[PDB]
């Protein structure tokens, strides 16, 4: 398993909105097409949100995932990673239900309460927004992404009972320290899949110093008992992916995180970003991990042990 | 102004509770004695909270500061820094009122929403808590210390109109990036008094790498247009103060931040921690800044241009 | 500006002086093997070729002026790549021997090593000692007392002597002190910006190849030189592509070549220098960046031009 | 646990880099050096780092005989650990440099971990006009000083001096010296706990920026883990800033006129003890305590002050 790089592809998310790009997957069949194409391009893990087909807004209901999860599983042995973040305005009670019902191999777990600033995107996109909800959502200066110590404890206990393991989303140093508290108490066992998230307004930035700081903090707190993945938001996506691959870590791409393929060019598919990451990985002389290798690296329960 | 180190003394705060130490100042006269003693020991800035005299709980009313501010000002020319943090469970609308009414030279300004974990303190102190409010407060696993982007913009505009400048409390990298957003928009003007806070549960830790990361980030984001202060929580108080003093920064001590004088000994006065910091500063060949020197370094309006 | 944003210079160091012929049949030795290696690497995308020469009989380092005569003109006739002539030679050599090729040929670019250091080749004994066919290889790799001499007076001498010929330098910095040494000379005005600073990772006697080492060298160069430098990196051995990727992702330039790394991948020796250039180019293009042309490298590095050399 | 919070102060009383014309307070004669050492120990320095000088012209003297009126005198007056240089002056050969530590078998000797340039000529801008001695001008003006410490040299010193029970203070002037030490440590030529001194601010070595300090510390942490004790040396005006960083980070500190001639703004340091007192004030201001010689011997695993050949 040495020299295997796990590519996670986050195909749609809840931060970008449909008016920002006609390539953002919205319908259930657009999301499954995107996931299947990304897995076939080399993504061992697919990170999934759902959306209302009517207006494209985030949909975190249990039923929203039924036409998504089984469809991808019939076509691909990729590891399906179900969000517990949903949209950052949502409550824990709403957010936990899909992963709780579907008992996936992986679920995201956001490790601290934070501001979430989407209003930067309002300068670029205000003129082309076709839905009022996009204007209100992106303009909201009071978004709080809630993940208290009690909330995280509750998600760890509830979802852990179903065999689900977590992608721990850490947006700044404090989230690694928060994770260390739960690790020391034994509420999660290794190996920890720790994803350091760079470049979001409200989180740490995407400077090389930020990347090395999160890596050296994770090394110190968890030593050998974790696997490192990175998420570089927006135009930082491939720079930070290349840093991680070169440093022994794993890589997240996807239109959830970055709508662009180059300067003034939108990415047309999730698979396209997977191919770019795979080109970097193979250029390093490394190899992209298969789903089976990702399951071994992350000690996952298996694609035949889920509730879909 | 070269080689002057500003010592801020935070005399009581809202995180420690009275059952933890008989030396924690509770009454107005205890708080004013503490402030005057700290300033005479060499603290140029006194950072102030108030408490209910009955049960010692945090009191962020305008009236609670009335027997405090004028008494200190009559005895000392120290810069009085009024909290806008209050207790981390409080709303912005409650927290803003003292600084809004009294128009101080300096007020704290917390730069991001974050978890605040006090339940660790339950390990050492649970057996000696005298008040039920202390059990409920310390045991609360769902504390959200709220400071959204809209919140912070509101405090900046409202208090800046009274001539108040801020001590920007930055508990992790994202808070420096948050501050950069407002600085770039012109909502606060330099020199920025940036206090990097280490070792709180919910914030960055107190490792030397954590200190350098915050310093390097502030240097890159703000260049020469800021003044750096550190707060090392608990047992980290003097180590981190010494790092800052040796690196051209400023220092915060006080029983708000650390109840201890050494292993197994409570600090009896705020002044005693000021004296320890002053011993480090003078050992380095530096000098402790006077209040007038702090006002020049921080571009403050003056101790007699306040509403008390 | 626009024409140079996102352009990554690939330097290819085709043979060097550290690896020895017994270590790989693909190490270029003869003048024509070296020119073939340089031309193929340039055609694969290397804008700069970094050059040493070797004795054709035993493959040992040859830093005579004559050794470069069948090399430089041949490559220039076939490629417009910038030719970077070593002033390092082998680390056992004196300044008086090392300076003569660049002094004579007046290249656009010459390496300039920025500090005296131990140079340990004995890490190569474990893998290679038994297969060494030449006694000179055994004596060289086993030498525990190699001093790679680059005193303050030496570096000043080389700066003055080669600078008079219009040659600009690739400043080879093997640890923090070499950046500080360069800052001393920059402050005295003995070299002018933009400084082409190459930070070298993983050599025994130099800094290692840990990611922290890379960031430390980058941060130090940023603080000392601000905007007035161009950053390149070199990772020894299996660190070569990892460190090239870090630099490309951070706004720097990259060096590959069999002078630095004999491998193409896991369990696979590199058959050509071009192969390593293609791997670096795949990383650069995967990032959405582009490989710089020789003309772009000349502009980025403020070089005198391929028509202004003595060959 | 009883050694928790103890900070070793080493005092380097004269060295070989500063020269007599730079300061009348730089110790030169044997009795000036012993007075300086005893005063520094009494101020709280648990280790004294020693060089000797020719009494006639003040130039570095690394002969065995030069230490004869020094080592026994200090030992009679103080139980401080005596650390004998094997660096001498940076122009000297290994064979000259090794002889005092080989003969006297000290508890501690310096061990410089890599070959490097040594730039003294910046000191000419400040001090050129007051230089009395021809040797001072030609030494400080020499742009070609190579402080030689090859891999072969270091191996030879480790083997020879280790046979006398001497343990080393590994002087690391840049990252590569830590990596060089890691090579010998992995080969078993030195055993822990390694006493690793990171030297900041010399021309030819790493600078004295806070980034340099944390970089050297995080490198030593990664390469040696728990099996080392950290000391710092900040050259010149960085002396107390870098000492304070180390004390606040769990390390130990070196002061002395070997490293810094100054006390403050335009004020020469009058004694070594004065710099020990400043370091001690920082240590005690942190709530830590200065280590005694016995505590330094335990922290550094030294053979004892009665196990030396003087
Ligand atoms: C560093 C050095 C000692 C390494 O020599 P080496 O032993 O041949 O090479 P490395 O150990 O670094 O890498 C080869 C190993 O990594 C593997 N490897 C190489 N490239 C790889 C890749 N892209 N992906 C995965 N593995 C790779 C090989 O399979 C081999 O594995 P093995 O050790 O299990 O057999 C030597 O190459 C060197 O000194 N280079 C610098 C020379 C120099 O100084 N040049 C001048 C600079 S100024
Ligand atoms: C580093 C070195 C070049 C400094 O030389 P220096 O000029 O005598 O000393 P510095 O410049 O560092 O400090 C003196 C200057 O800073 C000021 N200064 C020094 N200490 C100060 C202090 N504690 N507070 C305030 N100012 C101070 C002085 O007033 C003077 O200012 P000025 O330049 O405006 O006149 C030289 O002392 C040296 O090399 N020391 C190390 C020697 C050595 O190698 N030892 C063995 C190492 S293994
Ligand atoms: Zn998501
Ligand atoms: Zn407060
Ligand atoms: Zn070369
Ligand atoms: Zn010495």
Author numbering:
A (entry chain C), B (entry chain D): 3 to 310
C (entry chain A): 0 to 310
D (entry chain B): 1 to 310
From the reporting publication:
Next, a β-keto acid cleavage enzyme (BKACE)28,29 converts the non-native substrate MSA with acetyl-CoA into acetoacetate and formyl-CoA. The Claisen-like condensation reaction accepts various β-keto acids that react with acetyl-CoA to form an acyl-CoA ester and acetoacetate. In these assays, BKACE15 from Paracoccus denitrificans performed best. BKACE15 forms a homotetramer where each active site is accommodated in a TIM-barrel fold, and consists of eight β-sheets that are surrounded by eight α-helices.
The four monomers of the tetrameric complex are indicated by different colors. Substrate labeling is shown in yellow for acetyl-CoA (“ACO”) and acetoacetate (“AAE”) and in dark grey for CoA (“COA”) and malonate (“MLI”). Malonate, CoA and the corresponding backbone are shown in dark grey, acetoacetate, acetyl-CoA and the corresponding backbone in yellow, zinc (Zn2+) in metal grey, polar interactions in light grey dashes. As previously reported for the BKACE from Candidatus Cloacamonas acidaminovorans, a close homolog of BKACE15, each active site coordinates a single Zn2+ ion. Earlier studies had proposed R254 as a catalytic base involved in the reaction. However, our structures with bound CoA-ester prompted us to revisit the nature of the catalytic base and suggest a different mechanism for the reaction with MSA, in which E171 acts as the catalytic base (discussed in more detail in Supplementary Note 2). Replacing E171 by leucine abolished BKACE activity, while substitution by a chemically similar but shorter aspartate still showed basal activity (5% of the wild type), supporting the role of E171 in catalysis.
